[PDB]
Amino acid sequence: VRGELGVLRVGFTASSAFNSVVPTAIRAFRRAYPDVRLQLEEDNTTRLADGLNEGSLDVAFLRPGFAGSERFHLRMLSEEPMMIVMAENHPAASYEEISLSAFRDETFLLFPREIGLTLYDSVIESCRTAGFEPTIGQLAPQIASVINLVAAEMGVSIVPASMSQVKVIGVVYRHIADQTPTAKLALAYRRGDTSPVLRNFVLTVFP
Amino acid sequence: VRGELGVLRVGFTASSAFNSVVPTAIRAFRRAYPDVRLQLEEDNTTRLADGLNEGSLDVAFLRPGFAGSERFHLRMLSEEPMMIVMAENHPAASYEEISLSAFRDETFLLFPREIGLTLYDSVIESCRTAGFEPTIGQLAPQIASVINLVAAEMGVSIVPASMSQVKVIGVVYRHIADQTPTAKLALAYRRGDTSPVLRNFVLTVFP
Ligand SMILES: C=C(CC(=O)O)C(=O)O
Ligand SMILES: C=C(CC(=O)O)C(=O)O
Ligand SMILES: [Cl-]
Ligand SMILES: [Cl-]
């Protein structure tokens, strides 16, 4: 009955909390191991990987593919389509089918690349696969902040599909008919960290 | 034509971005002063006030009432009701009218008090006015994170009404029939900071 006491420091990105796997895993662990204290931290993949490396986090829900990710265990938990988010009165909002080529001259809002290089680069790659280099306008700190600026008609963005729960008045979400990479979420933890609390958490997320 | 170039560091809390005043003000300023670079930071009132004090922020959308707030200019921008957020299958979800006394023995999820003492204390005060001391369960980093854990049926919370745009599957928002303090948002900036860029921003938010 090891690993039933202690504190586990658990990190996740702000957008990842909107993917059901994150609350589902947290709730499942709290039920199975009620005496373990979950200290939750919300931060982007760059910071979460740094926290794992320095020992200030024990496990993270982050986006895979960052430089040096092979130094950790990463287990895929969710892959989801990306969607376009735009103002409700954007001309493309009444299109039967959305193609990214419609936005070749449109301003894209994004978050700063340095906080999450893989997801940022996947938005860029999506536009490149559609044949253009996106014009990037105002940067906002998180995807939820980006969406709120989309409501103010400052541009469009590309977001994990689960962000379509964020029904800010004046925005719409549309599926992309073009081929686009998924947004990816993995559970991440240190190699050779044999803590029984961490093991109990990992085996709760992957029964 | 002073203050039409430079960088303005503008802070706001994660939940405040969901109040229309924040995107409305940002868009209005970007239109009126296109050459000024808006560097946006999303952080809680404690950090935003510290940033103003140390000069790493020039202006913030924050919640008024913090210790030492008299050292800054605060101009009220929005007051909004607070609402209860709960799982869709919570027994109170099918009540005609919601009273906080229904939750006297219910677990409340919250964010850590230290990041935003006034809003946290106003949730506590709401329950006290309804006649009870709330039992606080799992803490999550931001209000949006709290809402996602409410979807996993880990408790209920009390949120600014504009967070009802965050339609996480499995949660519902209800108005509170009890008297509760508003959630409050003010524009905050340093006293005796005579920068023309900051002045142009303040006068855009308050035309
Ligand atoms: C902005 C991001 C990118 C990241 O942190 O990897 C997110 O919310 O997941
Ligand atoms: C959690 C808070 C409280 C604060 O930062 O004042 C918010 O999102 O506004
Ligand atoms: Cl492996
Ligand atoms: Cl004053």
Side-chain angles (χ1 to χ4, degrees), chain A residues 12 14 17-19 22-24 26-27 30 38-42 138-142 144-145 148-149 151-154 164-169, chain B residues 12 14 17-19 22-24 26-27 30 38-42 138-142 144-145 148-149 151-154 164-169:
Chain A
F12 50 80
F18 289 90
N19 188 307
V22 173
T24 290
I26 289 168
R27 202 269 172 197
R30 295 273 314 117
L38 291 191
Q39 183 191 304
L40 302 181
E41 160 177 359
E42 188 175 274
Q138 180 67 231
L139 296 176
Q142 300 297 330
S145 337
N148 279 291
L149 298 190
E153 305 180 76
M154 288 175 73
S164 67
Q165 290 166 108
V166 178
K167 306 293 203 199
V168 171
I169 300 308
Chain B
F12 50 80
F18 289 90
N19 188 307
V22 173
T24 290
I26 289 168
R27 202 269 172 197
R30 295 273 314 117
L38 291 191
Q39 183 191 304
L40 302 181
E41 160 177 359
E42 188 175 274
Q138 180 67 231
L139 296 176
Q142 300 297 330
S145 337
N148 279 291
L149 298 190
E153 305 180 76
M154 288 175 73
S164 67
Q165 290 166 108
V166 178
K167 306 293 203 199
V168 171
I169 300 308

Side-chain angles (χ1 to χ4, degrees), chain B residues 126-176:
Chain B
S126 291
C127 295
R128 274 175 188 163
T129 296
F132 67 97
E133 195 67 25
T135 294
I136 308 307
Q138 180 67 231
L139 296 176
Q142 300 297 330
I143 296 172
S145 337
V146 165
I147 290 164
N148 279 291
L149 298 190
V150 168
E153 305 180 76
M154 288 175 73
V156 305
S157 199
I158 294 172
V159 299
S162 49
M163 298 298 294
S164 67
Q165 290 166 108
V166 178
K167 306 293 203 199
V168 171
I169 300 308
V171 312
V172 299
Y173 298 86
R174 302 284 315 268
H175 283 103
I176 295 162

